[PDB]
Amino acid sequence: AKVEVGDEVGNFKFYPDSITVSAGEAVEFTLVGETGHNIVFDIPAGAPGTVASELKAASMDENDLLSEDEPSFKAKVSTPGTYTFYCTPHKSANMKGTLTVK
Ligand SMILES: [Cu+2]
């Protein structure tokens, strides 16, 4: 799947903010615009440790931002369920989306 992160007008959004993928299908986040962003998954409380490792490996580090020099990030989640992801700089601005894995 492909998700655009931000736009050329500097809005703090994922495009689309809701994606449904198959197990193990990579979703490629690509930066659009000059504002840096990243993607970190929320870890469901109560999640088994296998789902928590997977979601952490599918997340960018705190000190990592997509830039014109690193414009994409690829995440793969194979466990069925729906997961929330957000951008750390603009988490306050409701810059978030959902990933449904079938
Ligand atoms: Cu952002």
Indicate which CATH number applies to the domain containing 67: 2.60.40.420
Range of the domain at 75: 1-102
Specified resolution (Å): 1.8
The enclosing H or E element of 54 equals helix 49-57
Which stretches does DSSP call E strand in the chain? Answer: 2-5, 14-15, 18-21, 27-31, 40-41, 72-75, 81-86, 96-101
Burial environment of residue 41 by CB neighbours within 10 A (0 to 12, 13 to 18, 19 or more): buried
Q: How many domains does the chain have?
A: 1
* Residue 45 half-sphere exposure toward CB, CA atoms < 13 A: 0
90 is in an annotated binding site: yes
Cα 53 to averaged position of ligand 1 atoms, centre (Å): 23
19-31 core/surface letters (b: 16 or more CB in 10 A; e: else): bebeeeeebebeb
Distance (angstroms) between ligand 1 centre and the Cα of 19 equals 18
Tokens of residue 57, six digits: 């490996």
* Separation of CA 56 and ligand 1 centre (Å): 18
Instruction: Indicate the length of the chain as a whole number.
Output: 102
Give yes or no for a contact between 90 and 37, defined as CB atoms under 8 angstroms apart: yes
How far apart are the C-alpha atoms of 43 and 49, rounded to whole Å? 10
Output the CA torsion sign for 44, 46, 49, 50: negative
Burial (0-12, 13-18, 19+ Cβ within 10 Å), 74 = exposed
